[PDB]
Amino acid sequence: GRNDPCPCGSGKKYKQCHGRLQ
Ligand SMILES: [Zn+2]
Protein backbone atom coordinates (compact mmCIF):
# COMPACT_ATOMS: atom_id res chain seq x y z
CA GLY A 1 0.00 0.00 0.00
CA ARG A 2 2.95 2.35 -0.61
CA ASN A 3 3.02 2.84 3.18
CA ASP A 4 6.55 4.21 3.60
CA PRO A 5 5.99 6.59 6.50
CA CYS A 6 9.20 7.02 8.58
CA PRO A 7 11.39 9.71 6.96
CA CYS A 8 10.80 8.16 3.55
CA GLY A 9 7.24 9.25 2.69
CA SER A 10 6.79 7.00 -0.34
CA GLY A 11 6.18 3.28 -1.08
CA LYS A 12 8.15 -0.01 -0.93
CA LYS A 13 11.19 1.95 0.32
CA TYR A 14 10.24 1.68 3.99
CA LYS A 15 10.06 -2.11 3.57
CA GLN A 16 13.73 -1.94 2.54
CA CYS A 17 14.39 0.86 5.06
CA HIS A 18 12.25 0.24 8.17
CA GLY A 19 10.59 -3.00 7.01
CA ARG A 20 13.58 -5.27 7.71
CA LEU A 21 13.99 -6.19 11.39
CA GLN A 22 17.10 -8.39 11.71
ZN1 LIG B 1 12.33 4.87 6.15
Give the CA distances from residue 9 to residues 4, 22, in Å, rounded to whole numbers and listed in that order. Answer: 5, 22
User: Experimental technique used?
Assistant: NMR
Q: How far apart are CA 11 and CA 22, in angstroms?
A: 20
Ligand 1 mean position to 1 CA, how many Å?
15
Ligand 1 mean position to 8 CA, how many Å?
4
The residue type at 17: C
Largest CA distance in the chain: 22
Ligand 1 mean position to 7 CA, how many Å?
5
Ligand 1 mean position to 21 CA, how many Å?
12
Which residues are annotated binding-site positions for Zn(2+)? 6, 8, 17-18
Which residues in 1-22 are b (16+ Cβ under 10 Å) and which e? eeebeeeeeeeebbeeeeeeee
Task: Put residue 11 in one of left, alpha, beta given phi > 0 → left and psi -120 to 50 → alpha.
Answer: beta
